[PDB]
Design a protein around this ligand. Sequence first.
Ligand SMILES: Nc1ncnc2c1ncn2[C@@H]1O[C@H](COP(=O)(O)OP(=O)(O)O)[C@@H](O)[C@H]1O
Ligand SMILES: Nc1ncnc2c1ncn2[C@@H]1O[C@H](COP(=O)(O)OP(=O)(O)O)[C@@H](O)[C@H]1O
Lengths: 566, 561, 211
Amino acid sequence: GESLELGIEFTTTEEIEVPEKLIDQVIGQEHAVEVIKTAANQKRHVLLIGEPGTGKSMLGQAMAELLPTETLEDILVFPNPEDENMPRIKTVPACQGRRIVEKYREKAKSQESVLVPKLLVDNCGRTKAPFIDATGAHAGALLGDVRHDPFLGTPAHERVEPGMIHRAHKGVLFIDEIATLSLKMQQSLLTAMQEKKFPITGQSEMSSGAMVRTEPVPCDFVLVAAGNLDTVDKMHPALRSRIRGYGYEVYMRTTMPDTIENRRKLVQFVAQEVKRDGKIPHFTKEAVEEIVREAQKRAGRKGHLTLRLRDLGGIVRAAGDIAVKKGKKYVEREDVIEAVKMAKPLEKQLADWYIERKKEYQVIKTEGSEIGRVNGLAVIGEQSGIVLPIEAVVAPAASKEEGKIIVTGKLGEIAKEAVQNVSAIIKRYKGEDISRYDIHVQFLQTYEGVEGDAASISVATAVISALEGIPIRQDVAMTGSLSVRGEVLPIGGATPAIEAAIEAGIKMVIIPKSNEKDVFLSKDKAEKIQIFPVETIDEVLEIALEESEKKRELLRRIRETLPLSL
Amino acid sequence: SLELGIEFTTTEEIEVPEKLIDQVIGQEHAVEVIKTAANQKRHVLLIGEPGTGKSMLGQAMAELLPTETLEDILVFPNPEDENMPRIKTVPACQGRRIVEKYREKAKSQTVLVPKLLVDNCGRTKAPFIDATGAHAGALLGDVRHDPFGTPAHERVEPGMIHRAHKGVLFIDEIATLSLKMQQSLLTAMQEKKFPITGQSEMSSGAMVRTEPVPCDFVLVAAGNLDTVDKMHPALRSRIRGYGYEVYMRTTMPDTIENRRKLVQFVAQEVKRDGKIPHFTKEAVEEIVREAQKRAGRKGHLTLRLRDLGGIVRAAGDIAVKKGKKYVEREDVIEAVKMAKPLEKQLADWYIERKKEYQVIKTEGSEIGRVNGLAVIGEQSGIVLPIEAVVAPAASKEEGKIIVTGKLGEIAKEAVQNVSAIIKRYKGEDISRYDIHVQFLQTYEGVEGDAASISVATAVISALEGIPIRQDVAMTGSLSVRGEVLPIGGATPAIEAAIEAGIKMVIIPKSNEKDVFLSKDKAEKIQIFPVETIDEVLEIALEESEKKRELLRRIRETLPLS
Amino acid sequence: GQAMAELLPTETLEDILVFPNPEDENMPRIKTVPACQGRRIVEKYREKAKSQESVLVPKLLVDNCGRTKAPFIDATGAHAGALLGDVRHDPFLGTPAHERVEPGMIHRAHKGVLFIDEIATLSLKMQQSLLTAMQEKKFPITGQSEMSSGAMVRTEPVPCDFVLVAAGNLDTVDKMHPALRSRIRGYGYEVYMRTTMPDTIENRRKLVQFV
Ligand SMILES: Nc1ncnc2c1ncn2[C@@H]1O[C@H](COP(=O)(O)OP(=O)(O)O)[C@@H](O)[C@H]1O
Ligand SMILES: Nc1ncnc2c1ncn2[C@@H]1O[C@H](COP(=O)(O)OP(=O)(O)O)[C@@H](O)[C@H]1O
């Protein structure tokens, strides 16, 4: 059998307890959770900065549940006998608003054998402070508006519409992408935050609503603004300064340690997601384990689990949908594996489509050995791996005064400097004669370019192979950065890279020892390939170069130029 | 002919399926997502080019929805507050009756009959409402203006979101809807109910707002690669976070089953166009040959069915003009020429103008002159004469390879890869010369690495004084170890050679399956697929001991494998 | 585009009339009749109205009486209201919504040709609306400015069965609404104009005809 320790024994998630309140359902953002609790108690504004689907809105909703619920109010607007264009405002305990209006409305009907106040905000029946999401709202929606009057017309007070700031009175006002609001909206929000009251007035100068401006309307909200890294510098400086000086700024984390306790929380995660969705079956232990395996793969950091839970939640819902279509009673591993494929976001679908097309015209060799030809590995996007064949040949120098290392493949800056670090090793073991050769290296078919330094050890191997005439095993693939002292440095996407080797039929893959905990392979795939974690360039060469006296002499010669420390 | 996995004489014999989901051609991922989503009422976002079947998948999803549970929506007068008409939903067909009940009382008389907003009585399929481009009042509902007076409830009009209650609401180009309408759409999605009110503030309908009206629709939104970045953020997060996202494929595997779908496709296109005759079998085969050439991908068929449908129609129009009873292969061939993409007419125009002032030898042999082949755009080739001459180095310290022709970045690196091979076989003497290579008359530039073997041949010929056959044309990329790499547009390249009267063409072996020629053209040219640079040279260079020595020298610097 | 117009049928041309809607003033009703009939119908109602003031008069939106060939309507550079139709504002006891209805060039092109050069310079919204008109062959007239009372008026769909002849130079291709180009491409033809012809005796003879 193949399983993981989840810190709890269960058959299906139906046995897993789901915390009652939202704040306890938030996983892995301990700091953000502590800020929200303090902000809810001390009534302070918050700015949440992070990637989408990281729980910013969830936190805003959680804060709402932590606010007092026994003094909620209704907001009424009445006609002003003394100044029709300044409708009067009144707040009363929740549920009272409906009664007051109902009462006046009945009298008005009766009398026509009287003016009726309008209920702007009705909080009757609320068991918790309001959560108002004003993300992307327009000026009138956010701050309130007053309809135009074509005519003998309509009383100004009943043309008054509340803004989300008013609906958020004694609750939470959530605004993601806060920096995309106009400067004027951000200034007005700031004013509302300072006064806790904000008059409603018509937004369009061309409307008769423009001359109507009610008494200040209560808007005692706790603001929970959100956005990504660009938001910081684009938002109204005065608004950011206000939150910063009277509240908290939080940067959302994207990973959490892969500990037994944290996995146990992911068990809770699947359960709360199934419960919140209400349209999917419960998950068996194997299915939850697959969810955890996905969390490890999506972390992008060894020893950690992802906190991109909107995405992982998408996989939970898709797995359930698939189970339902198959008429199953519980979601199983097979359903999760199928959900991962079916629920890929647009970005990964494009990356995979691209790599699929490239592989159809790939020139990969996986049997025998070749001089100056090595199978490197590349990762496109987040998870799209592909074998990266690289070739090298040695020629007499075109210039009588110097030897050059000429590399092609549209390399970006990091890749180009990676080749320079490699050349230091080459020049050192080869010696003075190096100035007598031009070494041409070619990353085959990289028409969209080469980025990063993960092909460092590959270039080194191809070049050393070409210089010495020692063939390179084609059944070997490799990836790894390199230091000028010969140390193999870590790379990103070890799993996607290894999966590409496996798909291509490569039997052995070399990776930095630093990345051994970044390898996530099912029992099945693990049996198809031998993984060699390495720390130094000489170890890469002893695995990749074909055996001979020539090779052993080469290794000895190279080891002579590397530090003993290595 | 070709195997189409179905026998028939004309498309008139081909049966177009019952289920719309079955009609959809080659978007297997999308089809499975639609089936999985319909079953669970999950929203779906389809991203792809126009005419790729987005609307089709939306209609198909409506069909996969329950029908026995549809409901009618009625709006009633509200005695307490006229301006807030009341809403009642009941099982389908029950709406029509409830209306007459009250209507009878009208006779027995003050009695205000409720209005039937949405009537699904008699529907066999869940509703499919295409709200693409709708204005606010049409999408969200409206209340007619009253100069005086008519009862408010009677002036209420359902929005498409309401007509789509328990059905599918389809919106292509969703990101072009005002951010405000997108907001209302979001709310309608969140609550599954949305109050109807007057949209224009110039109207008295604006003082009316009904009770939230049910709008439990499944949203199938559509757009292109720019849509997600442009739509209302709250709407975007909702869809990206809780629905399925699908990128519409642009090609499909070339199998018997898929070709069969292309037959069905032709059949459907003739039927819905209604202005053209049916297609014989060979005509359909020609449509498939086109699907193959348009894939620009060996072993695949194109999925820009809007384009294929364009050829079908142009072929039909040609059949009609000639007074033919059926569309035949000949008609389709003329259709391809008559309805080509403006991009191809442009490339063809350009190639035609250039041929007028072109230097082209197609017989004999020449030292330092090779007939390379270039592909302009996606499906138009032209012979690319490349010349090389060897001169004394201008610098006594280094020899150089100077290439002209306005080469882009990839073409320049291709030249560097070629110089590796030249330097290796030529030895140290190479630093004693300046090799000038010229892509003749390439005033709009040279792009890509498809001229790699051509440059290698021209340079080797010039260095060795070995004439190159002019009745040979060639295209292919190259690795520093001498391996010939694949190129794009192998067919258009070969076609240029045929049009130029060149008898032999060299192409990489890996592109062998990218060659799509009719029997007529195939018999006019000899195709030589190659794997390594020495094979290119043995075909293109004139026989001589000089050439035999060159090949021996070359093969000595290439891998043995 | 003009040549194509001369090749279209000319015996079934119609007149387009807009009438007042007793049941919903903001949705004027539309009626098409054989060419020349429109003028008569209006003339008739107009005379009765005059008489009665000791009645509402329908408005003739498109009058094709006397045309010997299908209309050629050049909408190059036209604004939204000119292309798709508009409804004038009402300052006041006012003017019936139906007589404030103005036809768009798409309507005038009903059963004729709608020519639009520099098609890519039209706003995206105009191109989307044109696409809709092409698909339905009918397009309601509504006020273009939200600030106008014409904005709340939206007539029944008005016929606009035109054959579109869009034009432009090489930049047009990539700048126009992709859905519009795709529509023409899949249900019509794209043509690249040549700039030269062979210098043959036959072609010179045509230049004689040209002068
Ligand atoms: N840290 C987390 N713990 C639990 N669930 C989370 C977390 N982050 C995201 N989610 C889940 O993701 C869904 C989407 O998150 P959301 O709050 O909308 O993200 P954001 O506002 O940052 O885009 C949540 O409603 C919940 O199901
Ligand atoms: N995948 C497909 N399978 C079958 N027909 C297709 C496909 N894509 C496009 N078409 C054909 O093209 C016409 C236009 O497609 P449509 O669904 O309107 O595309 P989109 O909504 O993406 O514009 C269809 O009604 C049908 O005739």
